[PDB]
Amino acid sequence: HKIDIPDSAWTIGIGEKFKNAGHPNVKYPMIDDSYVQGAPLGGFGAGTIGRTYNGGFSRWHLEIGKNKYTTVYANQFSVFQKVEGNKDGVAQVLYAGEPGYLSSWKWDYPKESGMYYALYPNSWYTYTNKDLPVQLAVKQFSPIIPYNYKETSYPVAVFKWTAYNPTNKNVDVSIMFTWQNMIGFFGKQVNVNSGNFNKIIKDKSKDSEIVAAVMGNISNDNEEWNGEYSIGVKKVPGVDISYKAKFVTTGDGSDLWHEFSKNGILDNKDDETPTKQDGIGSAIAVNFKLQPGQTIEVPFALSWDLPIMKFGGGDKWYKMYTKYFGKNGKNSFAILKEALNNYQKWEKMIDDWQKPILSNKSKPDWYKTALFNELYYLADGGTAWENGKVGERTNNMFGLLECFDYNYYETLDVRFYGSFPLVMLWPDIEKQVMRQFADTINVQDSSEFKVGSNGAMAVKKVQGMIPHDLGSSYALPWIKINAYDWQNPNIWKDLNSKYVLLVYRDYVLTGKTDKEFLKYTWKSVKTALDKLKEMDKDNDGIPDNEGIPDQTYDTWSMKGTSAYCGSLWLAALKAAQEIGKVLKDNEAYIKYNEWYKIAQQNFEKELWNGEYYNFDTESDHKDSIMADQLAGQWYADILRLGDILPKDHVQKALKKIYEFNVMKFENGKMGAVNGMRPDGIVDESDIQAQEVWTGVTYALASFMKYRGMTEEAYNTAYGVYKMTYDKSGKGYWFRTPEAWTKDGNYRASMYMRPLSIWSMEV
């Protein structure tokens, strides 16, 4: 109890069954890993490990770009306790479940005997069990730290244990970490355990004894599958350390457990014999005597040196952390040791960055829960961050997935919303990613592909058009762009605009100092806008939508001028004028001013209806109230470009959207539904109209807030938090979807868009 857990921590009971869980609302197959989830461990680009609220290591994102949900049962903390003057102690795995293998271990950690807490990047378990006299807690984390691109990359996790004797008898206590040697868990085509072997490192520095297990393979190949895992522990005063190098994971486990269940002391048996077919594992234990009212603290850690990521198109790359530890895959212990000797400083750095928000008492706790915990996705979103192609440079390219069902890196129409944490907290990455986009503006690929929607054929990448994405983990990230094919992004009317807007946002949100960034991207920017002007068929100064989904709402058709694409256009034209003034490009300034003036008038005349802006000029659903109708004006605010539309009209539109899209949709308890009829019935023109998009809502909430509709902002955002985290929601913690319908069922779990919540902190 007496450990420093913040009140805004999301919490749930260990072993809790959740009764209202959502499921996918589409016909085609889609990922549904259940609600047994937790906050990820692991750095940016290191690959991540999802340890759930029940205690299992179950959501593996170690193969970069893939999601594999499966509990590796030998991966556990276990405990032994014995009250002085009792015949027998007891031993228990801290896992609220059971396996096949390991039948001798003590499974099924009981209900109503502990809690899980999460405030990303930290999570905690507390163990308050009728049969466990000594109270235990653990704080686990990886050093995810804004404006630090070093520790933030590390494939490491720390588990700081606290143990308290409230009783009046002396108790002997042990805490054991077990890990399977997971070399060959993926990337290995034959003989998945063969050549795996475990060794014990005893590092005996003055005041810093470490005992570690290094679990690897005898091969020195340089393959995605090869590397080391390490688990270990730092000696503190009053604890003894014991270990077991090699127990069989594809066995009953009694080789390990009979010695731990006796007195909580392992055999200290080293054995480097490689295995052939049997799965193997290691065990690191502490044992201590706790006197009445005594507290002891002890840190364990877990590293993983898997230096190569491979994508399905053939390319192999080094992971970013290899810059600081090496590339040979023999460095797990160096990574473990750095963590064991520096974790206290890392806790403080995490504290130093969370404090400004946590200590602001004008903000409710639920909003802090959502803001920090939504950050999980930055590590867990199949994040790729390279330090050289294998057998190959200034930069380190970066990609974040849109999601796993739609396995696209950096989908631009989505990162327009989802990119806020990177511009605000890791701006050097954000500027790297946007240079990656600038570099593709004039790539041509005349090779043709089949459009999944209408069936027709189209060119892959047209010169002057911004790509929808920078490839797929199943193909070739950064090299082969436009992996997406359900529509043709080369005629989308939003991407070029959002591109320009993202450029100027990244200038503006990093202090308006970085002229070199504007200089590098300037030509891509002029090109993008010049190309989109060519799509103005009817000569009103605004690109026309073509009676098809030619924008991010990729089944929802727009025709003529639309509020969404049209507002983005005007804002983009305004940003360009500004960049043009900054760089002293008189003719850009003059031209983009002229186009903006004409487009502005005409947007107004075509679309303003007295109450809101019409969805578009030409659809059968033209008079629908769209949640995202003024997305250009939202970005203009963040960009400090002023009114692109009249203040009074923007206020009316927002008020209307709140009144209709939020309030008339399940009593405003679930976010902003995308499309509503002026009669107050949800628009049925497409499935996307009947969906709430979590990131459109959080962005809309931020817009509301900058415009002083503070109560409407937080009420609108609340529905998203509620659905995601709350007992009355749908069980989407650490897998926030793109969307849900009125019944609360979902589409596309683990989704980038909801990172838009950070726009609320601008």
Binding site for Cl ion (CB under 5 A): 26-27, 294-295, 315-316, 364-365, 390, 407
Burial label for 685, CB within 10 Å (0-12, 13-18, 19+), is middle
Residue 26 interacting entry, from ligand AEZ, Cl ion, Ca ion, none, C-beta within 5 to 8 Å by type: Cl ion
Q: How many CA atoms lie within 13 A of 687 on its CB side?
A: 11
Nearer to Cl ion, 4 or 365 (CB): 365
Q: Rounded to an integer, what distance in angstroms lies between the CA atom of residue 176 and that of residue 283?
A: 7
Has 4 been labeled as part of a binding site? no
Has 271 been labeled as part of a binding site? no
Residue 538 interacting entry, from Cl ion, ligand AEZ, Ca ion, none, C-beta within 5 to 8 Å by type: Ca ion
Q: Are 339 and 347 in contact (CB under 8 A)?
A: no
Q: Rounded to an integer, what distance in angstroms lies between the CA atom of residue 316 and that of residue 298?
A: 38
Has 536 been labeled as part of a binding site? yes
Nearer to Cl ion, 405 or 494 (CB): 405
Residues in the chain, overall count: 762
- Beta bridge mates, 135: 164
Has 538 been labeled as part of a binding site? yes
Residue nearest to ligand AEZ (CB): 552
The residue from 94, 542, 644, 654 that contacts Ca ion (CB under 5 A) is 542
Burial label for 318, CB within 10 Å (0-12, 13-18, 19+), is buried
Rule CB under 5 A: say whether 544 interacts with Ca ion. yes
Residue 380 interacting entry, from ligand AEZ, Cl ion, Ca ion, none, C-beta within 5 to 8 Å by type: none
Q: Are 480 and 471 in contact (CB under 8 A)?
A: yes
Tell me which stretch binds Ca ion (CB under 5 A): 428-436, 481-489, 536-544, 737-745.
536-544
Q: Rounded to an integer, what distance in angstroms lies between the CA atom of residue 375 and that of residue 142?
A: 13
Q: Are 461 and 445 in contact (CB under 8 A)?
A: yes
First-to-last alpha carbon distance for the chain, in angstroms, is 35
Has 548 been labeled as part of a binding site? no
Nearer to ligand AEZ, 12 or 412 (CB): 412
Q: Rounded to an integer, what distance in angstroms lies between the CA atom of residue 181 and that of residue 188?
A: 14
CB of 492 to ligand AEZ, least distance (A): 8
Rule CB under 5 A: say whether 637 interacts with Ca ion. no
Nearer to Cl ion, 163 or 503 (CB): 163
Q: Rounded to an integer, what distance in angstroms lies between the CA atom of residue 148 and that of residue 485?
A: 36
CB of 124 to Cl ion, least distance (A): 19
Contacts (Cβ under 8 Å, ≥6 apart) of 717: 367, 370, 697, 698, 701, 757, 760
| Strand, helix or coil for residue 664 | coil
- Beta bridge mates, 122: 119
Residue 484 interacting entry, from Ca ion, Cl ion, ligand AEZ, none, C-beta within 5 to 8 Å by type: ligand AEZ
Residue 552 interacting entry, from Cl ion, ligand AEZ, Ca ion, none, C-beta within 5 to 8 Å by type: ligand AEZ
What CA dihedral angle connects 89, 73, 135 and 255, to 10 degrees?
30
Evaluate the omega torsion of the peptide bond into residue 121 and state whether it is cis, within 30 degrees of 0: yes
| Strand, helix or coil for residue 149 | coil
Instruction: Identify the CA nearest to 673 among candidates 629, 525, 664.
Output: 664
Nearer to Ca ion, 493 or 649 (CB): 493
Q: For binding to ligand AEZ (CB under 6 A), which residues are involved?
A: 402, 406, 408, 411, 413-414, 484, 486, 552, 554, 738
Q: Are 373 and 119 in contact (CB under 8 A)?
A: yes
In the structure encoding, which two tokens stand for residue 226, read together?
A: 């090869």
Rule CB under 5 A: say whether 538 interacts with Ca ion. yes
Residue 542 interacting entry, from ligand AEZ, Ca ion, Cl ion, none, C-beta within 5 to 8 Å by type: Ca ion
Residue 486 interacting entry, from Cl ion, ligand AEZ, Ca ion, none, C-beta within 5 to 8 Å by type: ligand AEZ
Residue 628 interacting entry, from Ca ion, Cl ion, ligand AEZ, none, C-beta within 5 to 8 Å by type: none
CB of 119 to Cl ion, least distance (A): 14
Neighbouring CB atoms inside 10 A of 99's CB total 13
Nearer to ligand AEZ, 172 or 494 (CB): 494
The residue from 410, 540, 637, 738 that contacts Ca ion (CB under 5 A) is 540
CB of 78 to ligand AEZ, least distance (A): 43
Residue 738 interacting entry, from Ca ion, ligand AEZ, Cl ion, none, C-beta within 5 to 8 Å by type: ligand AEZ
CB of 467 to ligand AEZ, least distance (A): 11
Binding region? 536, 538, 540, 542, 544
Binding region for Ca(2+)? 536, 538, 540, 542, 544
Binding site for Ca ion (CB under 5 A): 536, 538, 540, 542, 544
